[PDB]
Symmetry: D5
Subunit: 173 residues, 10 copies
């Protein structure tokens, strides 16, 4: 069970969550162990949560390692399409490269475009919301990347972070 804070959303949708706050949310998403089964569980957990909060809306979910090995992929409602896979690669590439969520990086972009800010092709990179690194307690560097696509940007980002914290907080057992 995952609930999206609605005032945190819309305070995202309307901008003006400070970067240092965003980074604080992100750094809260970390896991103790990361196991092939962990990836499956978390992936399905997110899939269920998205189906719950957003019925009838198609969403693609991805968990991949920093080298690209894909562990989990699903599609939630089936209005999805190949373009989802492009967003997934594109957001994921940003998150893995810069070490922050792809929402955060869009925020640090503001206006001014990926090309002239970070000197990267925007066909390759995607500064919209859905990518969030899966952090590791004890590793200083991410286990993997979690990526959501097909909701409004702020939702993709908040679903990832929320699910990632909710999940991590059920290993309170």
């Amino acid at each position: 069970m995952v609930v999206l804070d609605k005032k945190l959303l819309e305070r995202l949708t309307s901008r003006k969550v400070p970067l240092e706050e965003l980074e604080d949310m992100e750094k809260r998403c970390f896991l103790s162990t990361f196991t092939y089964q962990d990836a499956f569980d978390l992936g399905t957990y997110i899939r269920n949560a998205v189906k719950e909060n957003f019925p009838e809306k198609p969403v693609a979910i991805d968990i991949s390692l920093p080298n690209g090995h894909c562990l989990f992929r699903t599609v939630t409602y089936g209005g999805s399409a190949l373009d989802n896979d492009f967003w997934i690669q594109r957001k994921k590439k940003t998150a893995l490269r810069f070490g922050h969520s792809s929402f955060y990086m869009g925020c640090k972009k503001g206006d001014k475009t990926p090309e002239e800010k970070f000197f990267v092709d925007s066909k390759e990179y995607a500064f919209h919301g859905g990518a969030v690194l899966i952090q590791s307690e004890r590793s200083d560097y991410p286990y993997a990347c979690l990526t959501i696509s097909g909701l409004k940007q702020e939702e993709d980002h908040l679903m990832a972070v929320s699910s990632l914290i909710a999940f991590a907080n059920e290993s309170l057992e």
Copy 2:
């Protein structure tokens, strides 16, 4: 529940099995529906299957549309890796292009290089087995392609065909 005919596996392993036989199995793997949910059901079904039959073998499972859109992906156990992804892409590519299992296609060709017989890169197309198209009842053209990787090629292929036909065989 999916059990592999041990007879058929050893046959396949020895390349004992004629193309018209191959195609006949493959022509049997078909669904009347294929929704986004069918995808997820089918993928976890196989995931269970591979893990019951081959515990402690890391195996990669894909379901994609012919256009490349990935509906489902999973890893069956620890010790999977990149190059499971390459193999999945390379098998799938061969299967969707040629209209038969990547395994059938390896049966065809045998001992000639891919570059020689089909005029293809082989860094690009894989001719080992494990990629089985998902056929549609109402259409001459496949719904999707199911691709397994990480077992022996005859097993990646068998697991594919068996569980695909097993899954198809559950309906009311």
Copy 3:
């Protein structure tokens, strides 16, 4: 022997038709039974249609699978050129990557460049009407794509959509 609602064609040209209504029309373009023969019937059928409603106009008509395999291609009158082939590629490539027709996607774009909104090379992808997905009843995913080029963008779209829906009543 099909008819284009002059009012509708106009309701498109001024972009007065909301997305959910475009999807309405589109979702209704689907067939039971897609085969090689349905492809050819549909193509001949649209060929004739366009020729009867647009007699001196050089139109290109294509039917292709989501993996790009081409079932049907023709030109209607004598003024077609290689550029049509590019338009068909570009239009079809959009319809398949995105859930919807190239016209629907043209609309979702507005005055922003494809590069800017959807982040694609516009040399690679078209946003102009005339590519329409052929839906499967009970599959969630399209059988194939239908693409028309050389009429006015709103006419390309509507001839495609009208033809599928009309062809769909070929039920005997």
Copy 4:
């Protein structure tokens, strides 16, 4: 409603037909008046022909200009795949670059690799029968190309050649 000389088809398969005789046959494949409508008539005509002489065989049939613009494409039966599209490309690309059919050029090659004799990427160019230039009376240079794929190489060639010559008598 056309007929393949069983003896001739055999005289091809064993390569007993000298080049100048292949050119003989070929030089005789030509039309007065090439239009959009002749393209479609020729394509439908060959479609029917192949279907009547090869009923369960999945054949792809193409007509394209020398600049690549495609006038006609179809598949005959239900087993065609993207690989056919590649064969058509590759066969057609040879016929156009070189003065002659892809079969004629296959013959001129023998056991040498295309890379070795003609110095081309065989992934790019086919030497297998089934691409035949549509000649112009009084032009020195072909109207367009005709390509057939999916029969046996010698059958692909001969159906194309037989069809052009036979179609050519459509004179009224």
Copy 5:
């Protein structure tokens, strides 16, 4: 003997001339034959023409098939250069693709970038004039393309159309 209507040139220069006018001239440039010799005759004819009308202007003249095969090339005077070749390739490319003079195509589009209106590179396609297709009497599709370079674009185009029609106008 080829004289340019000085009226028509100044018109063209001022973009005074409607597309249907343009196409009408262009539709008139056609041969009943086009042999290898026709090519050489036509090319030297133009070569003479450009050099009588524009002495001491270096001008490049091409005749190629739509497939890229060069039948004829010459340089009319000293001070020609590479980039005459680029211009020739770029004009020819536009013309063969779009089915009209490279000049017509520049009339169409005017003030929009090529990338904007036709979705093309423009390092690749040129929209200045001077490339005129050579039409065939018996065919909807062009024999070849004639391309001139090194004058004012309206002249490269005019010289092209005039001498093409003049040449066509000599027969017994």
Copy 6:
């Protein structure tokens, strides 16, 4: 602090590749924590280590992360060249791409890499030794990759294996 086992080096240097053993050696190389400081402490540790054992021979040490981010790079004497960069890159990519070390994978083949066995281009992927994955007690996937270049491939590998297991314990 870390010492080679010349006997095992012998077994490596010819035939004893049983791969259960090579795997068992590799699964044995892991850290409980991985930090920026950890990567510098280890890279330094291995520098000193090869400078003791192989005093006069130029050798390159690198630790990077599965996504290619390079945390540490050094070299132990003059006469190292750009070709070391290519070796590191090349054998790292192998180790990162397959589940295993380079040299485990080299052992797993007596054939052409460029499309006999694994269908990858040899120019891109190196099947000699020197790349070893740093593992994670808590994860079934690796922290980073350690790669050494410029000794014999067996020695490149063993130093990597030995120094990792060493650094781990003490």
Copy 7:
């Protein structure tokens, strides 16, 4: 090693003219440059950056003009692959153009690297932090030194200082 806050602001304000920059830059050189020199140089810059910038992830690189990499390290957590891209893009500028990244950024002024200098922005950075290590007895650089993660002017000044400060041995 500590950065002169006046200089650093002068850099930031872009009131330090090219000849001065050149002068500071021309001043960074060595008598010996060896495999060990490089280590000595690299480490020494590392704790320096740790000292002056305790919270900040920073990647430090010493490479030869042919690309062969002698030293690489990161000073703290929070480093990413984009650091590597900056090291490449800044260093490429210095080795190609004969001055520091910072220098060329000044010389660039408001214009785009494509329009001035005619190069790809994606491939060539002008932010400073790359500073050519120089040789006495030679007209041409030993190697390049590159620092990234400190924003712009302190990337450059930390580099230049610790080169001079190392050069007095």
Copy 8:
């Protein structure tokens, strides 16, 4: 009027014209002036000669500068095809790159292939006969390259050289 020495041919066709002899033929092909008109004249001269010696055989003739600017191109009998243009570029590239005729270089190849002898792609290069540099009295470096394609290799090479010497020897006026 150009006559192909038949014993020189066939002593070409069968190999065993020494390289140093070939080079001697080649160095005989040079011009005093090279003018746009010269290119046209020589190009047509060759075209006529080929039509004479080889009626009914299609041959493509090319004269280009070392930077690639094409001055003359024709096609003799019209059985020609695009593949001619490929041979023309390919042979021409060899001649211009190595400074000898493309026949000579095929001879210096012998067996053993362009790839492992000269480290060049043979799709790009073409060590068959028809390319011959147009030399300059006083320039030490070629005016241009002359290229013939579509006869037997030795013929392409001998037609070029013969025509190039015949032509140069009519400026004996």
Copy 9:
């Protein structure tokens, strides 16, 4: 031996680009013979020349042939960089591709090269000065190309023009 004409340099350095004059200056640069020795004598001649006039400034001189074969290359002081290679390459390609010098062509444009005026990529082709075609009394096409880099573009061009006409006469 060769001296600049600071007055013409003035006319160049701003407005006097009439192009008939620039062409007339260029047609004037030719040699009656061109040899391997000629190319070395000239390259040396120009080295000395700029070392006199512009004593302390780094400058690169190159003569190559229309097909890109490089006969002579030098540089006149320290502080020349790889970027000089790119300039030489870039402005040579322009001069070799169009009928004219770079700077004649630069004058012929107040617009974007990369596809406003000439449709070529600026990264590939340089429209500043310093490239001048060496001509041939006997041919309507050029022997080779002379290109100088590292002064102001006007000076790069004039040195090239002046030294060529000089070398020609004496």
Copy 10:
């Protein structure tokens, strides 16, 4: 400068072992390397090659490890663009691998540059004639010197000698 015909045959016969090669090679170095040094070196090698090889077109190149070209010339008529390709392909080997082209050719033995060393033959030559100019006071080369057109072993030996012979000034 004149080539020892015994040595040259030893090179040709491939009886000179790597450590020896290294030794000759390690022996070629300089105290100063400047823009003028490079000219002095380059010209000096040119007449040398003219002397020992009066009929033979030969291209001589001095380049920095980043590719920046200080000296280029040809010694006679009969040069071609393929000389330039050899200069590139040989020099690329030397700068990448830390030894001479000739050296690496020996170390290559009968195997293909693809199968040993894992590189493109089209991009990397092993024929010798490229010889790294070395620095005293440094572990890493000043620049590369490359000679082409003399076949194989005399390309290499002319290079090595005239480096040593120049190094005694």
